[PDB]
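Q: What does the assembled structure look like for these inputs?
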Amino acid sequence: GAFGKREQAEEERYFRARAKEQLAALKKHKENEISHHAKEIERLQKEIERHKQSIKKLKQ
Amino acid sequence: GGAFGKREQAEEERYFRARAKEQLAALKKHKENEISHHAKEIERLQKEIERHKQSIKKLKQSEDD
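A:
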């Protein structure tokens, strides 16, 4: 009946929302990982900077 | 006799000049070694960064997938 397609419609919305909650949690995890790698990169570039300044001193 | 007095001094002069240049070379040697170590380190660190950048590239694709 009318109350049968409302159910269907709502059940559909429900499952779609569950599907998107999951896709978002997976993306969240990848973003966290990207985040870590980025952090490391910045750290390594600071070390490079230190070495580059050491060289500069020595060159003079 | 007298030309000996002179020649001895010309030789002494050459001797100390060479002693000076030997020290100068030693100094330049360690400077270059140091600079060299640092460069090597820099290259090593840049490769690590390259690894991380590739890791990100991957993660971004799989995430976009």
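Chain B has one domain: 1-65.
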